[PDB]
Chains A and B, each alone.
Chain A
């Protein structure tokens, strides 16, 4: 069996490289310290300072396009009107029956 016991010419599997040996204060972003530091800074500034704070403030103070206060005030004025005249609050029929034309069965 003169086979070399090697299936092919393969590079040996490299060992994992640690970013902390060649650069303490490594931030885990890049091997180049300057690119590393600036990547950390841009990530922190645009993620935490810009989006997370300003976007949260923007969402918090969104104008009432869902018309919650409008609906509340409409309901208050309507119930004030109906309590005054004694109408029985909300009617059971959403649409008035006189404008509906039922089909006569005659069965």
Chain B
């Protein structure tokens, strides 16, 4: 799936306009919470490296870390969801446009299919 050459793709657009037709991630998304947790860990490590009280050295600095991580994580999640939606849309369109390559398998019940039986002895 190389979608760099996908037709009608603006080069340096992070989020295209059609991406606005997709539901945005909730602000309580677990991935957003993980990004905020990553920011908090970055703040704790920053306090530790500089030899400061790890938990209660800079509250403004840790808040900025968490906020920036949440911001970037929200936008990254939007882009990821859009990209996966594009992949699914292309796959479904290709399947619809090539009926001869994806035939409907005949439904066959297990009562009429002969499977070899291997005893456990």
| Interface residues of chain B: helix, strand, loop or mixed (majority) | helix
Is A100 positioned at the interface, with any CB of B under 8 Å from its CB? Answer: yes
Is A101 positioned at the interface, with any CB of B under 8 Å from its CB? Answer: yes
> How far, in angstroms, from A95 to B111 measured CA to CA in the complex?
9
Is A99 positioned at the interface, with any CB of B under 8 Å from its CB? Answer: yes
Is B22 positioned at the interface, with any CB of A under 8 Å from its CB? Answer: no
Is A2 positioned at the interface, with any CB of B under 8 Å from its CB? Answer: no
Residues of A within 8 A of B114 (CB): 102-103
> How far, in angstroms, from A99 to B109 measured CA to CA in the complex?
11
Interface residues on B, range: under 10
- In chain A, positions 71-101 with a C-beta closer than 8 Å to chain B are 95, 99-101
Residues of B within 8 A of A95 (CB): 111
Smallest distance from the beta carbon of B93 to chain A beta carbons, Å? 39
Is B100 positioned at the interface, with any CB of A under 8 Å from its CB? Answer: no
> How far, in angstroms, from A99 to B114 measured CA to CA in the complex?
14
> How far, in angstroms, from A103 to B108 measured CA to CA in the complex?
13
Is B112 positioned at the interface, with any CB of A under 8 Å from its CB? Answer: yes
> How far, in angstroms, from A21 to B114 measured CA to CA in the complex?
80
Residues of B within 8 A of A103 (CB): 114
Using a CB–CB cutoff of 8 Å, the interface residues on chain B facing chain A are 111-112, 114
Using a CB–CB cutoff of 8 Å, the interface residues on chain A facing chain B are 95, 99-103
Chain A to chain B: the 7 pairs with minimum beta-carbon distance, closest first = A101-B112, A100-B111, A99-B111, A103-B114, A101-B111, A100-B112, A95-B111
Q: A99-B111, A102-B114 are in contact. List 6 more A-B contacts (CB 8 A).
A: A95-B111, A100-B111, A100-B112, A101-B111, A101-B112, A103-B114
